[PDB]
Design a protein around this ligand. Structure first.
Ligand SMILES: Nc1nc2c(ncn2[C@@H]2O[C@H](COP(=O)(O)OP(=O)(O)NP(=O)(O)O)[C@@H](O)[C@H]2O)c(=O)[nH]1
Ligand SMILES: [Mg+2]
Lengths: 206, 146, 344
């Protein structure tokens, strides 16, 4: 069971947390609730070379770049720098995040993500992006909301770390579910909720 | 750049993973979007749980039948539970392509957890093809024990 | 009368040893301190508690720089510590300036904030920049500030002069409430609500229902939001309400070509323009509007010291560029920026 410490970095409100949430739940959180300090979230993926786990360190975007946030970087093995395609300021800050990073990690795989490509009024067009050329980074347009390219970052990183340009995600063992017997005092009050659900409409996004 | 180059951190042998779905069956398979329901939020809401192929499977060595769904691209499981006798598909308010049910133990996270799901299909005609198939699988299972 | 441990990168967990305490020696022997600066360090809860006791004694304190003091602190500590600190500040009668920027707050720490901002009548300059408030807490902060106006009036307190609140994703969601806040403080001089995800309907409301009532406004920066034609027309209608405007920052606002033309047209109708700095980068502004702006600046903006047009939709080589430079040259005062990134 292989493990990789990945540092998730970027300005506030860019989608770092919403991104991680989708990968470990499938949901799309629409409420912005700032992250304090750092929150470590484990994500595993099954590949043709076995299961690998990324311990993602979702960091806070309000903390100034500096030696005070070295603990997050120390012993990292990869990283993701995020910015919002609808905010030029957010983009102008990338160079600062990518620097604070290499200051302690040096040479490690890093992918730059332009999030929110689903929004119409785009400011930072894919053409403009060049930073990845000067800094040897991989770039990706993504949308935690539509899922556009949402799995590329983890896939690219895995290939660089593992060393297989053709590594790919696969199945996932589908173990057998638990028994499920009971019924006595357990029954009844169930249908109470089942209604509270067959009534609440579903977010028509399709 | 065109393609950054790095030295591998680890060396992992080629490997063959089992789906744990070989002693399978596969009565039904169809694209769809699944929904998880609220939680301890107190703000009853439908959170997306995954988009992909739902599948019904009966065991050959036994009679057990279950629902199994995996997300696109990532292939993570987003629903995996047995179909019990006391399980249906009550419709969801409006709509005509959505069913909602209960499960005392979903194992999508390889951790036993009660769940109140809901799955949508492209056409209301597909919702029926799934509903009909689900109904009979539930029937066969009801007969099963005794 | 000045205590500071700026940029010392201290990891302050408790402040109990003889050392540690020495660090704050000056803060202890001098009750005459007028300014306290804690930026560049990480304050834990216990240390916050020790500092609160010692900060409430500073009765002549005028400025408190508490920006960037919680890096590495989790939701387990920040709310507590913040409560202790702001509790001590309420006890300082001369504290007119407070900076709380660059601290991960969000809803999870809105309690202390809401409490403080609604009862500290001495306040005149507020810096709540880059705090991750969000539209929910942002609306609550806005309401807290409305309270402040009422409590200020009941104590003949000085007006609020500055509100620096950007990079908080206030979004469209909290603009009904913010508009109301600006209605409560019509003697504001500086307001900057930069990069908040506010969209057209948002900007439209904020302008016509909010800032438009602040007749004394001097500095206004709404950089990096989204105006488009809707917000642009709102800006055009509002300009005549700020007779003493000196700085107008609209960089990265996607004013749109038609919108920019409308704004330039607005400036054209104003009289006695004392504008000194005009920022219009990346707005899709086209050559035609730039032409008229040049002549409006020549005939009506005699105090203009800075202009910014980089990133727009016109050639760095066009004639107007030289004509503009000519105006500033002839005056011996003026300044255009480097047009090294024109769009299209
Ligand atoms: N439309 C759209 N909004 C998105 C997308 N992904 C994230 N968001 C929105 O962005 C907002 C903030 O996202 P969040 O993950 O909380 O930001 P963060 O990067 O974690 N910020 P912080 O450093 O303060 O913790 C939320 O309102 C979320 O719904 C996207 O692709 N498109
Ligand atoms: Mg976050």
């Amino acid at each position: 069971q292989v493990q990789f410490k990945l540092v998730l970095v970027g300005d506030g409100g860019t989608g770092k947390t919403t991104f991680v949430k989708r990968h470990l739940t499938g949901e799309f959180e629409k409420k912005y609730v700032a992250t304090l300090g750092v929150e470590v979230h484990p994500l595993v993926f099954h590949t043709n070379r076995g299961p690998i786990k990324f311990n993602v360190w979702d960091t806070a975007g309000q903390e100034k770049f500096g030696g005070l946030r070295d603990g997050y970087y120390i012993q990292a093995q990869c990283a993701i720098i995020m910015f919002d395609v609808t905010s030029r300021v957010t983009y102008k800050n990338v160079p600062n995040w990518h620097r604070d990073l290499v200051r302690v990690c040096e040479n490690i795989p890093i992918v730059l993500c332009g999030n929110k490509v689903d929004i119409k009024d785009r400011k930072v067009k894919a053409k403009s992006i060049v930073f990845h050329r000067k800094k040897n980074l991989q770039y990706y347009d993504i949308s935690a909301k539509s899922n556009y390219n949402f799995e590329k970052p983890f896939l690219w990183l895995a290939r660089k770390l593992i060393g297989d340009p053709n590594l790919e995600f696969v199945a996932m063992p589908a173990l057998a579910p638990p028994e499920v017997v009971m019924d006595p005092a357990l029954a009844a009050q169930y249908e109470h909720d089942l209604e509270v659900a067959q009534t609440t409409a579903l977010p028509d996004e399709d | 750049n065109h393609d950054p180059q790095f030295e591998p951190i680890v060396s992992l042998p080629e490997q063959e993973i089992k789906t744990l779905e070989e002693d399978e069956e596969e009565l039904f398979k169809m694209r769809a979007k699944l929904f998880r329901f609220a939680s301890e939020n107190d703000l009853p809401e439908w959170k997306e749980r995954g988009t992909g192929d739902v599948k019904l499977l009966k065991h050959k060595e036994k009679g057990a039948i279950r629902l199994l769904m995996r997300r696109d691209k990532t292939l993570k499981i987003c629903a995996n539970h047995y179909i019990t006798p006391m399980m249906e598909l009550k419709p969801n308010a409006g709509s005509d392509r959505a069913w909602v049910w209960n499960t005392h133990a979903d194992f999508a996270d390889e951790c036993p957890k009660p769940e109140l799901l809901a799955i949508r299909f492209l056409n209301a005609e597909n919702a029926q093809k799934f509903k009909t198939k689900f109904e009979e699988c539930r029937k066969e299972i009801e007969e099963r024990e005794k | 009368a000045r205590f500071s441990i700026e940029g010392k990168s201290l990891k302050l967990d408790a402040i109990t040893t003889e050392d540690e305490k020495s660090v704050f020696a000056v803060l202890l022997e001098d009750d005459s301190v007028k300014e306290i600066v804690l930026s560049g360090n990480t304050i834990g809860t216990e240390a916050a508690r020790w500092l609160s006791e010692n900060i409430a004694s500073k009765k002549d304190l005028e400025i408190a720089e508490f920006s960037d003091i919680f890096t590495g602190r989790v939701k387990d500590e920040i709310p507590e510590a913040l409560r202790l600190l702001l509790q001590a500040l309420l006890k300082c009668p001369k504290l007119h300036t407070v900076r709380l920027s660059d601290n991960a707050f969000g809803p999870t720490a809105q309690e202390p904030l809401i409490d403080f901002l609604s009862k500290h009548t001495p306040l005149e300059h507020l810096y709540l920049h880059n705090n991750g408030l969000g539209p929910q807490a942002g609306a609550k902060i806005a309401r807290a500030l409305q309270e402040l106006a009422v409590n200020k009036k009941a104590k003949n307190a000085p007006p609020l002069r500055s509100i620096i609140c950007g990079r908080n994703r206030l979004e469209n969601g909290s603009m009904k409430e913010w508009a109301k806040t600006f209605q409560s403080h019509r003697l504001l001089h500086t307001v900057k609500m930069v990069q908040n995800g506010i969209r057209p309907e948002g900007i439209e409301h904020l302008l016509l229902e909010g800032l438009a009532y602040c007749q004394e406004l001097k500095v206004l920066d709404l950089q990096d939001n989204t105006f488009t034609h809707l917000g642009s027309s709102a800006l055009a209608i509002a300009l005549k309400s700020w007779p003493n405007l000196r700085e107008l920052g609209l960089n990265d606002c996607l004013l749109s070509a038609r919108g920019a033309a409308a704004v330039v047209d607005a400036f054209s109708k104003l009289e006695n323009i004392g504008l000194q700095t005009l920022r219009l980068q990346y707005n899709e502004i086209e050559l035609d509007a730039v032409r008229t702006l040049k002549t409006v600046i020549d005939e009506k903006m005699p105090d203009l010291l800075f202009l910014e047009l980089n990133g727009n939709r016109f050639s760095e080589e066009d004639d107007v560029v030289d004509e503009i430079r000519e105006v500033f040259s002839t005056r011996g005062r003026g300044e255009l920026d480097e047009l090294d990134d024109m769009e299209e």
